[PDB]
Structure formats: structure tokens, C-alpha cells
């Protein structure tokens, strides 16, 4: 009977494959074959933030596109004011193995988690004026790879136990559990409307969930190795994934298929970070060869290089207004490019 | 004016945070974190001395942080990269399915990893008494066919002197690890193998000496002497 179920699943996968093949009629490159190229744009290191001791695993921009938060393996969480290159709120962490950090949309809270299998929520503004652990969430049996604030009262986390969880910060309990990933989830990205979110895991698959009840609407399988980073298109109808097979891919919703892959022959290092520009024309991908490649998302031709680091980048982000891009690195340096 | 006022307030807050941060840097520099890794749960990592476990111990007024992985899945492909900056990886192997082959494969994967290529390994061979009991009693020979051709090295220095067969087996296992260590990498990181009987307190001294040698080699590499 197990063999019968395996045959049933294989037949269903084949049927989905034929449905996708019938859906595809013309590649995205053919559509954007007459589009004027970007023009080989170059961006210099506008600023360098150098307050961390150990490698920087994650950083997240604020809503105002002025304040950012960075987490480093020296157990440090620093909120930089990028305009005046100043720093505020150097938050010490209970566990020094933080691997992710998030900034609340309202700007009132900061999340961080790591090898402790726990997500700590810190209240930025207090009557005492000192940042303290507002709440500790521990519903994960594996390391927290990513976390994102939903509405300043709910948080979505992905862990190394192959599960995602939507929490309630007030009650400190798991509200919803998203399951279906084989490999541990490495990254997640919220939709602009906060109605859906995509998650990329250690398997080649990426799954799209809806936070209201979380039943894994769609699954995309185009990569060949672990999906390290995921980012969501500004219009909300597409997303981009970066994997360890040294390729980036652009999937789209409501078509359940690949659109275009970004890769080069002389690239043999995996992707660690992926982000989109304000209009979505540019796709910024961080690499393991200490460089950041800026791709024309419509033509899959390299448009820029951002080689300002000494070690792997491991994190990058673009401001809400698209003014500047911040890249962290394992050399304990943050760089703001514009 | 508001703008100079808030700029001054932000600058003084930055100065205070800078003071606290240099104070924290002083503590962080003199710590020498280590990663205590074991092939399986059978290995007696605990007596060597959720999510992650911390152990603080001082040797000759030198602080040491040992991190033991707890509530994590068996797939260590991703989170092991968090330990590329540790001073050493204390790899504990029970020298008593073929668990030895699994330990060898794990050691090879750790040694040949791209991000751990600069991290040194302190190899501990536990279950020495168990290995002696198994060797004297009438599974090592069949698991490793090359053991028959193996001969005890000249610098065996068998201090316990329990048998000329136990020493041969333990040195065969040590050479099995050293083959990978020497072949895969040269001039970047070093492997320090030791025999432990799990009833001795000298393990922390051996770890201290190996860490001293590791940092000496790292400093020597700055001048390209090594």
C-alpha cells in the first residue's frame, strides 16, 4: 500500500509538471528582449559601520529607512543611525549564537534568535529607558534561522526543526504551525500585504503559506541545493530565491513556475542573501566570494558589482524608499552603498 | 534649535555606548571559545569537561568557553558554520553499526569544510579501557582489513604497557585519523590527537597546551613563517 501511495504521489507530481508546462508559453527573456538595459550602474561605499567584534549574521532595515539593526556572534545587537553613522541601543544577548534579527514595522520592538532555539523580543522604548527582554518565545526544537514581525503583535519564525511558527507576542504562545518542509527552513519573506509569506528550506523546495491558517498553498522546486535566502517582489506577485548551487531564481505566484535564472559560468559560490530594489528592476545577491552582484532582473545580465568586503556577506537589505543598500559581512563590517 | 540639540544628545548616547562596547570587547577578546563535538551520544562528551550548553572553565587564569550542541537535529550542515571562528573543535571519538567509520566520515567532513578550513581540531580517543578489553578478548580486525598489514610505529611510547596488541590497535585508529588530517590540509590548520581513559583529569591540561600551540601557529602565520 505504501508503494501504491508513492505511485499516486509520483503521478500527481507528473500531472503538476504537465500543467506547468502547458502554462508556459514564452520565456520572460523573450518578453523583455526589447527593454533598454540598466546601463552598468556603479555604487560606492557611502558609509562603513565598524562596531561589531565577531562576524555579522544578520541585519534588518527600519521602516523609516534610516535606522537599522545588526546582530553579531559576539552576542551583540546594535541599532545604527545610518544617516549620522551613529549607534544606539547596543543590546547584549543572553546567547551569543544569534543568527537572525528583525525590526518591528512600528519600530518599537526588536527580535533576535539563534542556536538557543528561542526568539527574544526586546522593547526598544521603556519608561526606564533601558532596552530589556520584553518576552521570550521558546516553541522551537531547532535553531531559529529567520524571524519577521507581522504586525508588531505577531511574529513569524522559521527554525532548524523544519517548521515555521506564527506567534502571539502578547500571550507568548504559538498561534499557528506551518509544516511540510523536509530540510530545516533557512529563510522566510513576508508578502507586502502580510497575507502570505514564502519560506525556503534546506531542500530544493520553497513553500508559500498564508498566515491566516497556514496550509501551504504552493510549492516551487527549481533549485538543486539548499535555499539560503529568499526575497519577495515589491508588487507581491513574485519572489526570488538564492541557493548554494551558485544560482538565483525568480519564481512567480499565480503561475507556479520559474520565470528566469540568474547565473554565470565563473560563479561557483552559493548565494547567501537576496534583495530587490524599490521598483524591482534590480536584484541584489550576496555571494560567498566576498562580492555582491546586482542583476537586471528582467534580462539576467550582471549590471553591477559591490566588492567592498573581505569575507562572505551573509546578509544584505534595501531601504523601504530604496535610497541605500546595507550589506553585512563576516569581517564584522557593515557597509551602506548608494 | 532642535537639530543641534538632538544631534548632541545622539552623540553623547553614542559615546556612552562606545564606552560600554570597549568594555565588552575587553572581555570578549580573552575568552578562547571551543566547540565540543562528538560523533554520537555514546561518546562520553559530558565527562570530558536547550539548543546549546555552555561550560566556563579557567586554566592558569585563562578563561575557556566550551559549547556543546544540544537540542539540534542530526543535520549539522548549516549550523556548524557558526563555529568557524572558535579556537578549536574538540572532537571526541569512542575508540571502542560501525561507529568508528561514522566518526571518521564526520571528521573528514569537518576537516574539508570550506568555512572550517582554518579551524584546528583537538582529537580525543575515549574508551581506551573498553578498547583494551575488546582487543584482549577474542570486531576491529574485520571492520578494517588494513589493520592486519599495520605495524606499531617506532615512536609508540606505550607508557601503560598493557599489551603490544592494544597499543597497535589504538595507534592504528590514531593513524586512521591522521591520514585524513595530513592529506587534506597543510599549513592552514592542525590536528592534535590524544588518548584519554575517561578516568583522568589531565584532559584540560592537554586542551590548554593544544590551544596554546594553535594560537602560536596562528600568530606565526601572520609573518608567513609557517
Amino acid at each position, epitope marked *: 500500500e505504501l508503494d501504491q501511495l508513492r505511485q499516486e504521489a509520483e503521478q500527481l507530481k507528473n500531472q503538476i509538471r504537465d500543467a506547468r508546462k502547458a502554462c508556459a508559453d514564452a520565456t520572460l527573456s523573450q518578453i523583455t528582449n526589447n527593454i533598454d538595459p540598466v546601463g552598468r550602474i556603479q555604487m560606492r561605499t557611502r558609509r562603513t559601520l565598524r562596531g561589531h567584534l565577531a562576524k555579522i549574521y544578520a541585519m534588518h532595515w527600519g521602516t523609516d529607512s534610516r535606522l537599522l539593526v545588526s546582530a553579531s556572534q559576539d552576542g551583540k545587537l546594535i541599532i545604527w543611525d545610518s544617516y549620522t553613522t551613529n549607534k544606539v541601543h547596543a543590546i547584549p544577548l543572553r546567547s551569543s549564537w544569534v543568527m537572525t534579527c528583525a525590526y518591528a514595522p512600528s519600530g518599537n520592538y526588536v527580535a533576535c534568535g539563534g542556536l538557543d532555539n528561542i526568539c527574544s523580543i526586546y522593547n526598544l522604548k521603556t519608561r526606564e529607558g533601558n532596552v530589556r527582554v520584553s518576552r521570550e518565545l521558546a516553541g522551537h526544537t531547532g535553531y531559529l534561522s529567520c524571524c519577521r514581525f507581522l504586525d508588531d503583535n505577531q511574529i513569524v519564525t522559521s527554525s532548524g526543526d523544519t517548521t515555521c511558527a506564527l506567534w502571539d507576542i502578547e500571550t507568548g504562545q504559538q498561534t499557528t504551525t506551518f509544516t511540510g518542509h523536509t530540510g530545516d527552513v533557512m529563510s522566510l519573506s513576508l508578502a507586502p500585504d502580510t497575507r502570505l509569506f514564502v519560506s525556503g528550506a534546506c531542500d530544493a523546495s520553497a513553500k508559500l503559506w498564508d498566515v491566516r491558517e497556514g496550509m501551504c498553498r504552493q510549492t516551487f522546486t527549481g533549485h538543486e541545493s539548499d535555499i539560503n535566502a529568499i526575497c519577495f517582489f515589491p508588487n507581491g506577485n513574485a519572489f526570488a530565491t538564492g541557493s548554494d*548551487d551558485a544560482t538565483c531564481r525568480l519564481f512567480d505566484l499565480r503561475a507556479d513556475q520559474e520565470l528566469m535564472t540568474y547565473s554565470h559560468d565563473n560563479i561557483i559560490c552559493g548565494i547567501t542573501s537576496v534583495s530587490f530594489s524599490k521598483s524591482g528592476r534590480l536584484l541584489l545577491a550576496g555571494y560567498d566570494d566576498f562580492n555582491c552582484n546586482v542583476w537586471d532582473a528582467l534580462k539576467a545580465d550582471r549590471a553591477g558589482v559591490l566588492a567592498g568586503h573581505d569575507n562572505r556577506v551573509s546578509c544584505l537589505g534595501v531601504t523601504d524608499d530604496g535610497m541605500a543598500v546595507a550589506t553585512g559581512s563576516w569581517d564584522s563590517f557593515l557597509k551602506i552603498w548608494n | 534649535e532642535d537639530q543641534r540639540n538632538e544631534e548632541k544628545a545622539q552623540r553623547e548616547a553614542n559615546k556612552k555606548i562606545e564606552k560600554q562596547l570597549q568594555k565588552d570587547k575587553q572581555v570578549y577578546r580573552a575568552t578562547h571559545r571551543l566547540l565540543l563535538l562528538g560523533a554520537g551520544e555514546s561518546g562520553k562528551n559530558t565527562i570530558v569537561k536547550s539548543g546549546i550548553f555552555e561550560t566556563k572553565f579557567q586554566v592558569d587564569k585563562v578563561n575557556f568557553h566550551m559549547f556543546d550542541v544540544g537540542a539540534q537535529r542530526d543535520e*549539522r550542515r548549516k549550523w*556548524i558554520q557558526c563555529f568557524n571562528d572558535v579556537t578549536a573543535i574538540i572532537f571526541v571519538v569512542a575508540s571502542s553499526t560501525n561507529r568508528l*567509520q561514522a566518526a571518521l566520515k564526520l571528521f573528514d567532513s569537518i576537516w574539508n569544510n570550506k568555512w572550517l578550513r582554518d579551524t584546528s581540531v583537538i582529537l580525543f580517543l575515549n574508551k581506551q579501557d573498553l578498547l583494551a578489553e575488546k582487543v584482549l578478548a577474542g570486531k576491529i580486525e574485520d571492520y578494517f582489513p588494513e589493520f592486519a598489514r599495520y605495524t606499531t610505529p617506532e615512536d609508540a611510547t606505550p607508557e601503560p604497557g598493557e599489551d603490544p596488541r592494544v597499543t597497535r590497535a589504538k595507534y592504528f585508529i590514531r593513524d586512521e585519523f591522521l591520514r585524513i588530517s595530513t592529506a587534506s590540509g597543510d599549513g592552514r590548520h592542525y590536528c592534535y590527537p590524544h588518548f584519554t581513559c575517561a578516568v583522568d583529569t589531565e584532559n584540560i591540561r592537554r586542551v590548554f597546551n593544544d590551544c596554546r600551540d594553535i594560537i602560536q601557529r596562528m600568530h606565526l602565520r601572520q609573518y608567513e613563517l609557517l
Partner: nanobody, 128 residues
Framework: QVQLQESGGGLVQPGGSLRLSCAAS????????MNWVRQAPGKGLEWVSD????????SYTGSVKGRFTISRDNAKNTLYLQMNSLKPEDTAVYYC?????????????????????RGQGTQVTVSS
């Protein structure tokens, strides 16, 4: 998607010969190092052998060193394991595993349970 399908191997008399063929799809075969692992009844996954890209770095576990041989055809996108002298204690489910990262001399967690880039496996039983 990454799909590894193993074929061959049934009931074989002790001392007999067998051939296991692993067909791979969804990735560039030549970029990855391949592995053969096995799981005995009630024993857990154990590593049997591995071969690097384009061969030339073959290695086996000690138990099967003199008997089993592993080869690969990059053009045919296939992995082969020949078992020329079977013994009763190697009755197991055999899996074709593809290591997680391309262009890597190291590769992790093939023997770990719930591993993504592993096939369904074939039963190989040796008995009278």
C-alpha cells in the same frame, strides 16, 4: 526537482553478484560527489562508499573494501555499484545519496535520517 531512483537488487544466494543503478534527475550530475549508503534491518543508516566528480577519488568502507566497486557515468547521469561477493550480513536497504553542495571536497549528513537529497532505496537480501 532533485530525484534519485535506485534499481536492481533482490534475492541473491551468498557469494553471488549484484548491480545497483542510481538514475539522477534535476541537477548537473558531474558537479556533485555521489555516495552509496545502506540501512540494515533495525540498525540505522551507515556509509558504504563514495565517488568524487569524474571518479578518481574512490573510497569504500572497510567491510566491503575488497568486494564492492563504485563507478559513475557523468554523460549517462548514472551511478553504479557492483557487489561481486555477497555475504549474509550485508542485507540492507541501499540508498543513492547526493552530497548537499557542488564543487566541494567535503559533504555532510548523507547518513543522517530525513536527508533531502537521498533516494528511496532498494532492498538487497542475501539468504539461503
Amino acid at each position: 526537482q532533485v530525484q534519485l531512483q535506485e534499481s536492481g537488487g533482490g534475492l541473491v544466494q551468498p557469494g553471488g553478484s549484484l548491480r545497483l543503478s542510481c538514475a539522477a534527475s534535476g541537477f548537473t550530475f558531474s558537479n556533485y560527489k555521489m555516495n552509496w549508503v545502506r540501512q540494515a534491518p533495525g540498525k540505522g543508516l551507515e556509509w558504504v562508499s563514495d565517488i568524487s566528480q569524474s571518479g578518481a577519488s574512490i573510497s569504500y568502507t572497510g567491510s566491503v573494501k575488497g568486494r564492492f566497486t563504485i563507478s559513475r557515468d557523468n554523460a549517462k547521469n548514472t551511478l553504479y555499484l557492483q557487489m561481486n561477493s555477497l555475504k549474509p550480513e550485508d542485507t540492507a536497504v541501499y540508498y543513492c545519496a547526493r552530497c548537499p553542495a557542488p564543487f566541494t571536497r567535503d559533504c555532510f549528513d548523507v547518513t543522517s535520517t530525513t536527508y533531502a537529497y537521498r533516494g528511496q532505496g532498494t532492498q538487497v537480501t542475501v539468504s539461503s
